[PDB]
Amino acid sequence: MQVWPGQAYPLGATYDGAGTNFAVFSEAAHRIELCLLHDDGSETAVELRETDAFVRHAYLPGVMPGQRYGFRVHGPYAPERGLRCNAAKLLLDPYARAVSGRVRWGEAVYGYPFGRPDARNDLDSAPDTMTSVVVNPYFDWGDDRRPRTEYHHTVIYEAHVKGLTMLHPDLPEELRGTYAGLAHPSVIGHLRELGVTALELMPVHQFVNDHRLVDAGLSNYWGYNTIGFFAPHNAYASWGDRGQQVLEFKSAVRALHQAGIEVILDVVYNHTAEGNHLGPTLSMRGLDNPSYYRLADDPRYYMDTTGTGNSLLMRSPHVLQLIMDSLRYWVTEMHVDGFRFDLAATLARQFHEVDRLSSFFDLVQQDPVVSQVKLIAEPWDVGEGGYQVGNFPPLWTEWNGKYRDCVRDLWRGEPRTLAEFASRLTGSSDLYQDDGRRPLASVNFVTCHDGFTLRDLVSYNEKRNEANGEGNRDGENYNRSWNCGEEGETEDVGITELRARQMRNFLATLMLSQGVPMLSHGDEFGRTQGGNNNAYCQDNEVSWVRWPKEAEATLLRFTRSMVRLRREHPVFRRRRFFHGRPVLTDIAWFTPEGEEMTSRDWQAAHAQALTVFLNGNAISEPGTQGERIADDSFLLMFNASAKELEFVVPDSHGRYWRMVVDTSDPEGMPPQQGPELAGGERVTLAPLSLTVLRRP
Amino acid sequence: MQVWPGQAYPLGATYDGAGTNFAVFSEAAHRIELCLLHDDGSETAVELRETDAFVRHAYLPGVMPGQRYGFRVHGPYAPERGLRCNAAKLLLDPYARAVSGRVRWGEAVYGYPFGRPDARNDLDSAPDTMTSVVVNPYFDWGDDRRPRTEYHHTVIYEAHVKGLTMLHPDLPEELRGTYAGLAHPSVIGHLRELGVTALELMPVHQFVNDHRLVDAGLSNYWGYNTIGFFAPHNAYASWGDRGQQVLEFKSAVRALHQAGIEVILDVVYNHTAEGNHLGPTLSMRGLDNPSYYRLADDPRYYMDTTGTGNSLLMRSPHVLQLIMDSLRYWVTEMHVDGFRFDLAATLARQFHEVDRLSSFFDLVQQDPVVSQVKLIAEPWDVGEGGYQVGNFPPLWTEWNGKYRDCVRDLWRGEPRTLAEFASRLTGSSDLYQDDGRRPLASVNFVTCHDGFTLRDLVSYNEKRNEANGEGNRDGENYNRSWNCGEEGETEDVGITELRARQMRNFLATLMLSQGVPMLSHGDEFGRTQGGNNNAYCQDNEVSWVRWPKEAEATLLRFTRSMVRLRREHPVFRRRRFFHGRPVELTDIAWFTPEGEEMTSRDWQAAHAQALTVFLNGNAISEPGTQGERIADDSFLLMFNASAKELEFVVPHGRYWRMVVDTSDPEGMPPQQGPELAGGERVTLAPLSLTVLRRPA
Ligand SMILES: Nc1nc2c(ncn2[C@@H]2O[C@@H]3COP(=O)(O)O[C@H]4[C@@H](O)[C@H](n5cnc6c(=O)[nH]c(N)nc65)O[C@@H]4COP(=O)(O)O[C@H]3[C@H]2O)c(=O)[nH]1
Ligand SMILES: Nc1nc2c(ncn2[C@@H]2O[C@@H]3COP(=O)(O)O[C@H]4[C@@H](O)[C@H](n5cnc6c(=O)[nH]c(N)nc65)O[C@@H]4COP(=O)(O)O[C@H]3[C@H]2O)c(=O)[nH]1
């Protein structure tokens, strides 16, 4: 038999050489039973009797990795009390390091009769449920140098595990769309060729194909609907789901870490794949409903702060413990370099309000494992006071959703005051400066997985989510986009070259900006999604990354060479805001004709032209060793006008500035040199074009 | 000036091989300078310029360990807002891994002019102040097996580092009263001889003798008045103060851990040694006052839920981080095994009420370093809603204040504490069963550092603290004690035996009571504080532990034999609660002195001071380390707190053996006894105990 009492910590199934020590949390269970599934669907149940601080535990020697296991909570069923415990269902371990199988959708996985939401389901769950697996924690990272690339050298590349590699004509068939293929040399090379220093992996926690999707012809692609917070996703693993998916991810990191490539993965802690009531009872519903999920004034129904069914209680210690244990386990055992938190406002909702003194923030700021890895937050959620951009604690880094909306409104041509675009270029002073932050707190991005891609952003006015199954009712409605004259694809040479160069504008404005640049995957080649902007369920050629074999490889070498500029020239990645008001003047703003803009020229309604001077000799920032940082002085000239404009170079005839970037050109100016301008001489600059000059 | 920007983590002086990095937090400091002290007192200031998330820092190559340093925080001095920043006072390092020197009490360590509280003082504090020192973290714990003694084997021995060894006629005079003398073989041999598994260490966090106390002829001895949250008290060091005292501690833990004795130390996190205003500016008054201390509804004045000057803000993320970074520093760097939190209800006061969902409770519960060590609490503060015995989370253990009073009462004679004393032997079923805890969650104790020692407990009716300088106003006013005929020293052998046998009565009940016991240092030799019940300032023979050279060595072998009787028989240290009756095995049954099971009427019969308890050694419904069953001889405990003799009956056919008797003056847990029939009547003296041991 061999049922030893074991230990209470750590939570989950841990392989201590000769056996495995199990420990799960439930304060609302009279009895808890542990099931040991075999390869034929037989359950060898064991009662974890030894409770300690509402966590029941036991050590069962002989149990080893590959053991399919799960729990069955004997507890009250009373939605009136908030409890939905059911022994009939096979509950997943929240602390499971690897989950096997898919959810086979049926009336059994749900925990309530399909006609009576307050009755109780007595159907066995195991033959249709996912199944948590014990994992051997061993891995020999030889020299896993965490390439601790600082914020002022970081190029974040948002990408998917599957879409990035799925259609790659260099990975053998098996590896396309897996973690293993993500480690391939032709992808790491591409990533190292493109200049990225951080890789953002769209949700990699094990997530569930939604029932509403499976019974609609679709699947869950993005993966922002998760149940296994410690489990690499089994469907992204070509090495098996019997606890061998973690072996890929670890090896996927080590291969990536060898090339000086960081891994910052996208975490979704705000909600769970169990949805609201009327959803499935899979992992945490049956264990402890009241202290895992945020229930409403009527405990039957669920408080939502994400619009997606449920939301976790951020003040119950066993929920905070699960997230800190989740983060760290991905830091120190998966060697993940950082996290992009999803809708991170919900994580700071202690009772109702968004608190920046909330216990979650208190925890993260102090723990020596998480507080040092790159902490990125999506600074909003769909509750009251949901817009919190510029209110997270000064440790954090935020998605500048105001950079997206301000830049997409500049190149679109709207009367977005230049003084609204000029602080987004300076790196969002108005949002972060008083908070005690630096420009690197702003993660700038012209496009991400949400909204249009880059090609869709310069080709479509309104969304095209008909094929999502919701009558075009999902995604952002107006995306500050402009089709460039005709919506959809078109053979018009004028519309084509305009779109191909509007894209150039977006990537050029992004790199010359201050803070952290971010690229959505595919925009290097011009990835299209056919007007679809919220492709959470488009798991097909719509969201795959097509790979190039001329125009798509004109924009490619353009973008790479634009990254070289930001890298090579530290003026574009400064550690602290310019001031330059009274004395060296580290920034200056002149009009096209060549005079310093005035308070009246600045925010006058219809003005769409700028010249920006960036003083490379006024970087009062020490390097790593107190080394004073130098760089050539640059002259960025923006023309958001519909017309051809005449820009004067405002220094003197004394000196010479060489043009190094010019959006207008069809061959690509960031990868191709050009003429050097006199210094008082007039330079005609095409409509919706950009230009940069360089001088030491 | 080789000054590199350095890192912002961790806070404090860390030695990176080539040099040392300093990082300090202040969110209301415009300019922070790093003063580096020399041996002729001259300073060498350098700006910690690099402000990152309100943590200013720098790294200085070549700066070796032993360097005396400190921060001077230029900022606002305005007590109407709560700011007492003073760039004249040499602020300590809240993360000082060793603090040298002592406070020379003068008008210069005080930050304000003595006659005017809210004015400004520009007196240099440098020489009159302690100094935070850089420490080299190396120490070779070759094979330092943390003796992770279980919870149901612990015997806590609360000791002070100085009194334990200042008067031991075996250490060299160098080592009397220091950390090294605490780990001499003659001491660890005694703790081994006594059977303890834990050494509760009265505060070693480096503290300051109060100005209040030093202009009186006295000196703070206990040390519950702390500034150094990372340093060992330099006045306990025989090896030096320039960072060398940290070695004393690390090597004093190495020795105790080799002989298998754990380290539990007394932490004081609720309050600081700067007290309220009118007091010094040493570490946190001048660093960032409003974010460190819990301020009033008038920022000039300090909230005080402790009565010791001030209280700490348990909601500012950077005070909880200072606690945690301290907590994890004594386990991960100095190999401590647990902490006793003092006034631990103040730690949970997040705003006003004692919140068991306070961030602090959610921080300890989660952290892998601190949730695993022994978490012992003193569950009360003097503030409103202070007494919270039985209300801490289930992860926590408490000093059972309702045990101490109710056993002090019983042997004192009060006609109430029988049904109450019963549960206190049961393990305080009232206070802990429903909370989800075990009998072990209650630290039982009759006497501690507070109140009377055990000899004073039976030799005084009221306090005698005139020597403390507050005219007998401090401490407990009634401590639930009895003088046994005469208060003070007598020679009547009738009283003296009653005292020496009363001392046997508590220790007997303490080692036979369910849960975790605690021994105050010196109650083996019958230590006497001369009636001083609150001796926090008596750093003299009053609290010095007197080592014995006839009666003193009789009670000694009494206690040691009782702590064994706990060890060798697990019933007195059970791991679950009793249930008494299989409604449809009987593991406990209470009998009358007459010899019949009691009745709910006869239980709460007011006039009753006699008892017979049965314990079933064969009905321990608990597993063992390897699923085994626990087996034991069954015991029969006979309490007579009556003023006279009462004939006690054994419940007929079998035999029983008498193992414990308080009455006979040779001491009879080390002295073998007769065999009692099983129906026979037995005479039990007034205020005495008896235990029977037929094997089951
Ligand atoms: N010695 C010293 N000089 C100080 C200090 N604070 C400001 N200065 C000087 O005064 C300017 C104003 O700084 P700010 O208004 O806080 O506005 C600051 C702040 O927004 C940001 N910044 C610069 N360095 C840091 C830093 O290390 N950490 C953070 N968090 N922000 C920084 O850049 C702004 C100004 O950059 P600068 O070109 O440095 O211009 C700074 C610098 O000239 C200080 O505490 N000590
Ligand atoms: N920390 C901790 N404390 C424990 C544990 N088990 C018992 N205790 C405490 O000790 C009491 C004695 O339990 P019992 O003698 O087994 O008498 C128990 C036992 O026979 C049964 N029982 C209670 N819980 C369980 C359980 O989870 N499994 C099984 N099989 N029986 C249980 O019902 C009785 C009443 O249980 P309680 O009301 O809780 O009464 C329990 C509870 O107060 C434990 O695993 N951990």
Author numbering:
A (entry chain C): 1 to 549, 553 to 586, 593 to 705
B (entry chain H): 1 to 549, 553 to 587, 593 to 659, 662 to 706
Publication passage describing the model:
On the other hand, glycogen degradation requires the glycogen debranching enzyme (GDE; GlgX), which directly catalyzes the hydrolysis of α-(1→6)-linked glucose residues and the glycogen phosphorylase (GP; GlgP) to generate glucose-1-phosphate, which feeds into primary metabolism. In this study, we identify the GDE of S. venezuelae, GlgX, as a target of c-di-GMP thus uncovering a direct link between c-di-GMP and glycogen metabolism in this bacterium. We demonstrate that c-di-GMP binding stimulates GlgX-mediated glycogen breakdown and describe crystal structures of S. venezuelae GlgX, which reveal the molecular mechanism by which c-di-GMP activates GlgX. GlgX is a 79 kDa protein that contains a putative carbohydrate-binding module (CBM_48; PF02922) and alpha amylase, catalytic domain (PF00128).
To visualize the effects of c-di-GMP binding on GlgX substrate binding and catalysis we crystallized the GlgX-c-di-GMP complex in the presence of substrate analog, acarbose (Methods section). Acarbose is a pseudo-tetrasaccharide that is a well-known amylase inhibitor. Two crystal structures of S. venezuelae GlgX-c-di-GMP-acarbose were obtained one at pH 4.6 and the other, pH 8.5. The GlgX-c-di-GMP-acarbose structures solved at pH 8.5 and pH 4.6 were refined to Rwork/Rfree values of 23.6%/30.3% to 3.6 Å and Rwork/Rfree values of 17.2%/23.4% to 2.4 Å resolution, respectively. Both structures revealed clear density for c-di-GMP molecules bound in the same locations. Interestingly, however while the pH 4.6 structure revealed density for all 4 rings of the acarbose docked in the active site, the pH 8.5 structure captured an intermediate in catalysis whereby the reducing end of the molecule had been cleaved resulting in the loss of one sugar and density at −1 of the reducing end of the molecule (using nomenclature from Davies et al.). GlgX activity is likely inhibited at pH 4.5, explaining why the acarbose is unreacted in that complex, while the GlgX-c-di-GMP-acarbose structure obtained at pH 8.5 allowed us to capture a covalent intermediate. Comparison of the GlgX active site conformation in the GlgX-c-di-GMP structure to the acarbose bound structures reveals that they are essentially identical. These data therefore support that c-di-GMP acts as a positive allosteric effector by favoring the enzymatically active conformation of the enzyme. Key contacts to the −1 substrate sugar are provided by GlgX residues Trp222, Tyr224, His271, Asp342, Glu378, W380, His449 as well as Asp342.
